[PDB]
Design a protein around this ligand. Sequence first.
Ligand SMILES: N[C@@H](CCC(=O)O)C(=O)O
Lengths: 49, 47, 49
Amino acid sequence: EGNFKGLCKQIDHFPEDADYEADTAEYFLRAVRASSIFPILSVILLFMG
Amino acid sequence: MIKKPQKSKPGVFSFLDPLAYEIWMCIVFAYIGVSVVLFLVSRFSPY
Amino acid sequence: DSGSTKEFFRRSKIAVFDKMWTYMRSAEPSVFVRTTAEGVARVRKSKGK
Ligand SMILES: N[C@@H](CCC(=O)O)C(=O)O
């Protein structure tokens, strides 16, 4: 629903102001996020099963 | 003058906000001793 | 630039303020700015630096 429909962007985490690196609980949460790590692993044991 | 901070939210262990860290520590110490007192009275050979 | 505060730390005898002025004379490039909002949006794009 736009001037170009079906243009699929690749998206990751982006560095905003000061990045809150001291929030290592957040940065790790960012690190888990941009990944299919558990939904890919949800395939794995289901495939292995 | 420096930049604004953001509204950096509470974390994972936010739930234990109502108590001091030292209060929780007293609870566990209390938790053990109550059991072993019951382990004293129960199983004491009530012959 | 051409501020009394910029002259104050030149004349300030407090050791931390000296040490700031020791840095501020050695701050490369210019931390010093000519006009007001010049320094403001500089901080606003500094991302806390
Ligand atoms: N009112 C001050 C502003 C600059 C400063 O504080 O250094 C002046 O005219 O010198």
